Amino acid sequence: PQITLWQRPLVTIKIGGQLKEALLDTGADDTVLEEMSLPGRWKPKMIGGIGGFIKVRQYDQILIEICGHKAIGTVLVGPTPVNIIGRNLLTQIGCTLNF
Amino acid sequence: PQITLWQRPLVTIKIGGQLKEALLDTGADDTVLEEMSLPGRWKPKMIGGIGGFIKVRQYDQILIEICGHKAIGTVLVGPTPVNIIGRNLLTQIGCTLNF
């Protein structure tokens, strides 16, 4: 699709077998989701945003279907205000900014 | 252009004769810049994102050129580590997300 930007670009995602919604965020290097269960080993990481740093758990090679499109990559879990799909997964669906 | 997301989508911006660079950020409601000596009145307000909140000065009706495209809109000036072009200005240049 072509998504205009008059409202937040929220889309349906499927992760962990569950439907959620998340913000397509070209300003985020990687993907950060609110607290949830994911498979595999996690590693502690710090990530920085506009207001400072937060602690997250990093999971590797996680499957996420974004508007029906498959992506596999790193997913961070932590106290983000909103679920964010960052560039590491946007690239996997061929997302581009067009003007 | 049609900008992929393998690297941060930084573009040239021009305000008052000053050339800077800024991140095209679909995750931001607002545009947040470094100090640019914008003349005129402002309104203080708080914004936030990952990591917490920051104080900004809101300046309206700022003329900005973003990757060559002229726009007019509100700019928030505050202690952001990276200049961010948010949706309020992405809409004005006709920017969409596509996949």
From Swiss-Prot, chains A, B:
Would you indicate the residue range of the signal peptide? none
The residue ranges of the Peptidase A2 domain are: 20-89
Q: Where is this region: Dimerization of protease?
A: 1-5, 49-55, 88-99
Q: Which residues form the active site?
A: 25 (for protease activity)
Q: How does it assemble?
A: Homodimer, whose active site consists of two apposed aspartic acid residues.
Identification of the protein by name: Protease
Q: Where does this protein come from, organism-wise?
A: Human immunodeficiency virus type 1 group M subtype B (isolate BRU/LAI)
Q: What is the lineage of its organism?
A: Viruses, Riboviria, Pararnavirae, Artverviricota, Revtraviricetes
* Full-sequence range covered: 501 to 599 of 1447
